[PDB]
Each structure stands twice: as structure tokens, then as C-alpha cells.
Design an enzyme around this catalytic site. Structure first.
Site, short mmCIF file in Angstrom:
data_model
loop_
_atom_site.label_atom_id
_atom_site.label_comp_id
_atom_site.label_asym_id
_atom_site.label_seq_id
_atom_site.Cartn_x
_atom_site.Cartn_y
_atom_site.Cartn_z
N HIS C 69 0.87 -1.24 0.06
CA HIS C 69 0.07 -0.13 0.07
C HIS C 69 0.88 1.06 0.07
O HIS C 69 2.11 1.29 0.55
CB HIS C 69 -0.79 0.07 1.33
CG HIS C 69 -0.27 -0.15 2.79
ND1 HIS C 69 0.44 -0.84 3.12
CD2 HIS C 69 -0.02 1.12 3.43
CE1 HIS C 69 0.79 -0.44 4.30
NE2 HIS C 69 0.57 0.77 4.46
N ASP C 71 0.47 4.73 1.99
CA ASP C 71 -0.21 5.19 3.27
C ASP C 71 -1.30 6.23 3.05
O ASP C 71 -1.27 7.38 2.23
CB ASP C 71 0.52 5.89 4.11
CG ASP C 71 1.39 4.97 5.14
OD1 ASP C 71 1.03 3.80 5.07
OD2 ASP C 71 2.23 5.34 5.74
N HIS C 201 4.96 0.60 0.44
CA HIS C 201 5.61 -0.22 1.32
C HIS C 201 4.56 -1.28 1.90
O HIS C 201 3.42 -1.38 1.85
CB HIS C 201 6.01 0.76 2.63
CG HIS C 201 4.93 1.40 3.02
ND1 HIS C 201 4.41 2.56 2.62
CD2 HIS C 201 4.15 1.14 4.17
CE1 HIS C 201 3.27 2.90 3.36
NE2 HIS C 201 3.10 2.09 4.42
N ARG C 216 6.46 6.39 14.13
CA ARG C 216 6.19 7.00 12.83
C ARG C 216 5.83 8.63 13.02
O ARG C 216 4.96 8.76 13.90
CB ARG C 216 5.43 5.96 12.17
CG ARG C 216 5.15 6.82 10.75
CD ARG C 216 4.35 5.68 9.69
NE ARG C 216 3.26 4.93 10.51
CZ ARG C 216 2.16 5.63 10.82
NH1 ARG C 216 1.82 6.99 10.28
NH2 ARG C 216 1.14 5.15 11.47
O1 UN9 Z 1 6.09 -0.27 9.48
C1 UN9 Z 1 5.42 -0.04 8.38
O2 UN9 Z 1 5.77 -0.71 7.24
C2 UN9 Z 1 4.83 1.46 8.15
N1 UN9 Z 1 3.51 1.42 8.46
C3 UN9 Z 1 2.81 2.11 7.74
O3 UN9 Z 1 2.90 2.75 6.69
C4 UN9 Z 1 1.30 2.09 7.87
N2 UN9 Z 1 0.49 2.35 6.93
C5 UN9 Z 1 -1.04 2.14 7.31
CL1 UN9 Z 1 -2.06 2.81 6.08
C6 UN9 Z 1 -1.50 1.74 8.73
C7 UN9 Z 1 -3.19 1.55 8.73
C8 UN9 Z 1 -3.49 1.34 9.89
C9 UN9 Z 1 -2.66 0.78 10.96
C10 UN9 Z 1 -1.22 1.03 10.82
C11 UN9 Z 1 -0.60 1.43 9.47
C12 UN9 Z 1 0.68 1.42 9.20
O4 UN9 Z 1 1.60 1.11 10.31
NI NI Z 2 1.58 2.12 5.74
#
Ligand code: UN9
Ligand code: NI
Ligand code: NI
Ligand code: NI
Ligand code: NI
Lengths: 236, 240, 242, 235
Positions: C69, C71, C201, C216
Site C-alpha cells: 500500500h 499510506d 511499502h 512513525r
Molecule cells: O511499518 C511499516 O511498514 C509502516 N507502516 C505504515 O506505513 C502503516 N500504514 C498504514 Cl495505511 C496503517 C494503517 C493502519 C495501521 C497501521 C498502519 C501503518 O503502520
Molecule cells: Ni503504511
């Protein structure tokens, strides 16, 4: 009462019969026998028929109540058969397709039989009705194995979204392969009877904005069962 | 000897061992145990290994002879495992992928097990080798079921072109799921050992037009057998 | 300040920088330049950072607020970038994937460019956000064309279910192709910054159910515009505030 | 002399004409117009034909020489049209399907037009020829999809994508609303425009015998919307 074979795997025309409530027992048994065997049967020249006569004729065969589908598979107790009459046909087009899901199963490679025998689909309507049917059902009367799929299939149980769509289209491609289908050119005074438990059908929108009216009587059905005697599960 | 898991479904790094032709039986029994369990095992700082010292070590594991593949499955008795050593790497990129085909089978829904257990694939080399393998083999040592597919699969037996490519990709998607794979960043003096009977692998061309050199020693394997006990079939060619 | 490629299409490591609010403006320019060029960039051994100091550093790059996805593409003004810091890692696994959607578009054969340039996509959160984004957006800073898709994509405008899902998988296959991706093995003190307008990612759940926690910080982005200059259309839901 | 519409997107029946070399040019122009409009045209009750008199009628149209295909698209200058006649039919089945590839193109969403206008396919037999996926019809000027089962790959795309896009195109082309299924009777003759159609035989008569006499006409090299003509690989 001759029975003309239309295609190799589906379709028969039945001559020398005048459909109606006051019919012979031996005649009806020839019709059912032809229906079960050929999955869809056709009657030309039935210009005598109105609604009430067609409804009475249906009462002999059983109990009265676009894209490829088995009628109302989102429901658990979906119809056994339908009697369909033309009342008003357009000047061109308006033909209909049927596909034999019994022969579809028979012609499956043994791997895909393995798959489908143990596979279950979630049938839904696009008031939300949801049923989990087996992708293979045993026919109550003939005991034949028939694929149960069509456009009400949302997804397969266990499989993810991608796998569901992909496997779904694999089956439909076999179910609706031209050799396994029949396309009927409707003329006035025509009546089709099809076994809804061993077929899929599809209308064809190839008559533009022209009027096309049909009269349908649908016979009562029963809950499917797979090769291990497991019946369908309800949710909604 | 200590062995460290890298991921939940595949991969292990083994320290406390200098690889060579002269190794303790007990140690090689611990390496193999780790290889079978983790499907691919990685050794850091094996700078002593040259071609001859590598060949020797491989001879303790067995008999010495880009798209996701299992090596040489167009042959009936395709290799059991391989030892791969880095010599000349690029300045960046050039990692390698491994997929656990045993964990892949285990993760399948029961419907797809039914299918795969009874499915048979024709592997070819686009010499004209042709082999009908089962899509599921029983591993000769672990007895685990492993999915046998990859880029040499031309078709499935009894299915047409469309059905084949469709189901092929359905299986490969589950096999090459990131959670079922490991990507190895090569450092100099790294040595990888993988079970070719229970894995697929893929090289990654992300080092531009840089020079790359590895050294591979591949071990002799046996003919697969399905879950009912039916061997693979040689259509064309001859065993390795 | 050194910046090292980790791959031909994506990834770079930046060493020789203590991250924080008290950073040299010219150094930030080099960070940003690298981020836009290499799409995701990594810093090793930044043990000094915390929630507070990370947020401070983020503010220098822009304005602060599993399966493949980009983000929050179910919203119209979806984030421009993110700064991700490890606090607690499991003993094995937990690696993360990035894909370069700029490079993905560049590699497309001309016919597939025709399609994508003219293709729009309905994104959704499966609150009820629904947005029609272009499948190719022009990047504000770089001006590059980037494929905009990912797991929030429900369908393509004008196309039926089968067509949509089929074409969707065609693109995702090209985007997530190994050559066009990088996989990060997380160590304590590692920091990752990525351009969410030119990447997808994917987290990898290959650590069983061991404890994992990152932190984050997400930056404000603008509404995507297609190659013709038409902006994304909101169907339902508000844009992101702050 | 009348021509009747069989389906919205394809199919015409032409009644009240005896086929053969002995035909008024005025009738030939009315037949050719129907062939171009309706892509496939059918003649009922042509019992008095044979191999010689079919060929003579075929010359009035032009210059004489199972799964969804356009005939001989592995060739570059593939046929324009064919006149097919029933000589001996099975007792049941034996029907044939036609699809309208012009109507197919018109129905495409605009993004898929972008693709197909710029897309090129390598056609082969199991000769090799790179055709445009969209050709401009020499007579009508209509844009028609050009694919079928001789398509091995699309130029510039890998196997998977080619395969996956191919089925997307064929699915639309062979959509029932865009097709006609003809039930063959004795003394039936079909003419189809091979430049604007696909056809498929239906093998649904077990081990029975369906003899058909075909007369195929000469057709020019396709051109895409940009004017680029087909490239030959293996002549
Ligand atoms: O750890 C990773 O790969 C970074 N995470 C994200 O980019 C991320 N993206 C979305 Cl859309 C969500 C959506 C819901 C909950 C956590 C998310 C998340 O950690
Ligand atoms: Ni994400
Ligand atoms: Ni219906
Ligand atoms: Ni290999
Ligand atoms: Ni033909």
C-alpha cells in the site's frame, strides 16, 4: 412423443405434446426423464398456452412457488426448475443461453474434481442474503454431481480475494464453454423447461430498446448436499 | 554450534563453525538438521573456502554432480541441495531470494491441498528434457510435503493453457509471499546452503551492469514421489 | 555526509549525520535531495532520537500531522513522506519492503503508459473515505510520474470488476517486482524516511507474534494531479487536517 | 430482395436471392453493404449451389485464393471475407459463433482504447506477424479489434501480462451481446467479413461428420490508426 437431441451435452426438443394441466402420467414421465437427461427441454407450437394453463402444467412436474447465474443461489433452498414461456418477442435478438453444470463436473480433470468436491462458495445478492453452498452438489433425483457457481458467488471459503476470483473464472470458463451450452432463438409459442439444479443460464441484451416479455413459473427446490452428505449453511 | 532463525517460516544463520572438508560428524549432523529445518542456512566469514575446500565440504552433505525456480526440475532426479559462496560482489544490490515450498504446502487451504496432491506438472527446458513431476513431493528425509513448481513448469497434466498459467500463478503467489521468503544481503565470505527439495530461489538483478561472481556446488538428488507413492516420469532426455 | 545506494532502482543509506532539530540547513537539503532521488533512505545507529527529537527533525522536511500500500490513499491529500524509527525489535524477522512507483512507471511499455496515464482509480478504506485518484500522478518536487495504486484501490473508473482486478494485478506485479524493491533488516537505532508520493511499502509478518513497536511521524502532502493537470476527486470523507 | 437484422450488434439474413455468378451487380452492392454493416450475413434455402457456383459468386465480392479466431492472422495480408456453405451436416449441433470486433472496439472504455490503439500483437501458428491490436477497416473506415487464438504475445509486454490482457480483450469481443450463434440447416450459406469479426466452431456432435465448403477472398494488409502497417517476421 419424440425427443430430439439438440446438442452433444445439453438441450432437447420435444415434439408431439400439447402442454397443459390435463396431461397423461406417462407423458409427464417422458418429459421429466428428458429434462433430467438433457437439462433443458423446448416445446414449439405451444400457442394454446396462457398463464393458468402453464401454471397447471408446472404443477405436474413439481410445486410452483445480464451474466451467467443459477437462479437465487444466494438462497439455500433455490429453485429446482423453471417453465418459461414467450408472450412478446422482439423482431431481432432476445436469445438465451443454458449451460450444463452436470457435464461441466464430469469433464473436470481429476485434480479439479478433488478441488471442487471440497470447495465451498459464498453466494450473496450483490436486505442481504448470504449462503455458503458446496461448489459440487449431488443431484437428488439423478445422483449426478453438478458444479454450483454463477454470478452470485462472492468468494470461496478459506481462499483470499485473488484466489477466489481466479478459481471462480476458471470454473465459469469450463461451465460456459460453447460445447457445454445451447443458445435458443425464441419464437412465439415456445416453452423452455430447464433443471436449475444442473444448469446455469444467461439472458442476452441484443435487441436494443425493444419490448420483450416472458412468463415464468418456477418450481420449488431443496437444500443441496455435497459428496460427503454435508448440506448448505445459512448466515443471513 | 549455535544456529539463529532469521524468519518464522525460513532462514537460519549458523555461527561457531569453520566450513571445510575435515569436519566433525556431529557438527555436520547439526548443520544438516538446521538445513532441513530452516530450508536455507547462511555462514558468515568463510574466507578460507576456495573452490577445492568448498567442493570437499559439499561432499559431506551429498554427492557433487531472473525468475523464481527450483534448480533443474526439467530433470527427473533434480539436485537435493546446493552450497553457494560469494567471491566478487557489487558495491550495492545483488541480494538473493529463497522461498520455503514446504511451509507453502502447509499454509494451503484444504481445497488447494486436494488439488496440489493430485496435480502433476510438466517441467521442461524450453537438449530436449521433459519430465512430469508431481506438484507435491514427499521429502525423502523429513517426510514433509513440499510444493514442486517454478519457472520450468510449462503446463499441468489434464489442464489446458489458460487453466495452467492461472493455477501456476495462484501457487507461485502463495510460495513467494514475503512472509515465506528471505532476501540475503551478500557480504564477502558469505556461504549459503539451501534445500532445493524444499525451496525455490530467485536472483535479483539490481546491481546495474556491475560484475558479479558466485561459486556454486550442487549435490545429487533423487526422483520425487507423490503423496500416494508415485514416481516422476521421464518423457524425454535421461536422468542426471 | 555520505549517501550510499542499496540498489539500482531504490534504497540508499545515509551515514555521517546526527538526526535532530538542531540540524544544518544545508544538510537537510542533502537529505531531501537523497529522499526524492532514492525514494527511501536509512540511517544507522541513531540511538539518541526519541518521540520528541524525531518530531522536531521531521518538521524540517515538511509539516507533521500486511500487504502492499501507499499510506492513506483513500484520502485525497495523502502524506508526502514518513519518518519511521525502531524502538523495540523482535529477535528474528520484522523486515519491511519498499517499492519505487516512479521507476515502475518509467519501465512501463508505451501502451501501458497510454492506459495508466488515462486510467483513474477509486480508493477506499474498505468513517467512509472514498476518492478517485489518477493511476499516474505528477510529483510536485521531482515532476516525475508515479503509479498510484495499492491495497486501498477498490476499482478502476469505467471498468468492470474482472477488468479492474486483472489490470490492478498487472501493475502491482511490476511495482512489487524484486528488482524495483528493497527489504530492510531492522537493527536498533535504525531510522527510515520514504517518499510516500513515489513508493508503496509492505510490512512482513515473519516474526510470529513477538513484540514489535516502531514510532512513525507522518508529513503533510498535497492532492495528486494527473498528467493533464486534473486533480483527484473527493467522493466521500474530508481531507486530512493539520 | 430484403435484408433482416438478426441481432443488435451483429448478424443479418438475406432472403429472396439465388446465389451464383448469375447475379445483378445491383444485388451484389446490396449484399456487400449488408456484409459491411452486419459483419455476417446468412442465406436460407440455397439448395441449388455447388463448388463451381459458390466460387463464381465469391468472385463477385472479391478475389478468391476449436476456439475464437480470425482466419489466418499469423499471415499479414490475411483474408477479407469467406463464403461458407453446408454440404452435409450432423443430426444435432454443429452451430457456429461469430463476434463483431468493430462493435467490440466501440464499446471499450476510453482507457482501453488508449491501450489497444497503441498495442501490437505477435500472431503465429503454434509464420509470424506483428499486427496492430486495432486496425482501420479499408472500406468502412471503422476501427476493429484484431486478436484471436493465433495471438502468442503483445509487443513489449511479458508473457503473463500478454496472456492476462489478451483474455480481457477476448472476454469483451466474445461477450454474448456481441456475438451470433447460427444453427446450420441444409442449403445454408454464410458470408462473414473476416476483417471485422472472429468466429468459433462448436465441436458438440461427438464423432459425427460436418463437411463444409469454404471459399475465402483476398484481403489487404492491416493498418493502425496512425497508418503504420503490419510487420512480417516469418514469410
Ligand atoms: O511499518 C511499516 O511498514 C509502516 N507502516 C505504515 O506505513 C502503516 N500504514 C498504514 Cl495505511 C496503517 C494503517 C493502519 C495501521 C497501521 C498502519 C501503518 O503502520
Ligand atoms: Ni503504511
Ligand atoms: Ni435467471
Ligand atoms: Ni537456480
Ligand atoms: Ni476459421
Amino acid at each position: 412423443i419424440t425427443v430430439k437431441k439438440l446438442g452433444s451435452r445439453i438441450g432437447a426438443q420435444i415434439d408431439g405434446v400439447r402442454l397443459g394441466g390435463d396431461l397423461d402420467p406417462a407423458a409427464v414421465n417422458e418429459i421429466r426423464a428428458a429434462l433430467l437427461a438433457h437439462k433443458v427441454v423446448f416445446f414449439r407450437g405451444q400457442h394454446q398456452l396462457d398463464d393458468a394453463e402453464q401454471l397447471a402444467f408446472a404443477g405436474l412436474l413439481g410445486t410452483p412457488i445480464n451474466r451467467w447465474h443459477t437462479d437465487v443461489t444466494f438462497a439455500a433452498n433455490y429453485p429446482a426448475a423453471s417453465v418459461l414461456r414467450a408472450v412478446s418477442l422482439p423482431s431481432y435478438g432476445g436469445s438465451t443461453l443454458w449451460a450444463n453444470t452436470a457435464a461441466a463436473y464430469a469433464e473436470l480433470p481429476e485434480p479439479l474434481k478433488c478441488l471442487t468436491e471440497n470447495l465451498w462458495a459464498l453466494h450473496t445478492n450483490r436486505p442481504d442474503f448470504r449462503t455458503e453452498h458446496p461448489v459440487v452438489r449431488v443431484h437428488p433425483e439423478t445422483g449426478e454431481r453438478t458444479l454450483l457457481a454463477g454470478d452470485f458467488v462472492r468468494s470461496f471459503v478459506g481462499l483470499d480475494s485473488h484466489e477466489s476470483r481466479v478459481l471462480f473464472e476458471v470454473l465459469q470458463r469450463r461451465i460456459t464453454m460453447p460445447e457445454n451450452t445451447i443458445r435458443w432463438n425464441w419464437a412465439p409459442g415456445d416453452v423452455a423447461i430447464w433443471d436449475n439444479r444442473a444448469t446455469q443460464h444467461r439472458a442476452i441484451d441484443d435487441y436494443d430498446d425493444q419490448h420483450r416479455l416472458m412468463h415464468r413459473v418456477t418450481l420449488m427446490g431443496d437444500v443441496p448436499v455435497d459428496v460427503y452428505g454435508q448440506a448448505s449453511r445459512v448466515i443471513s
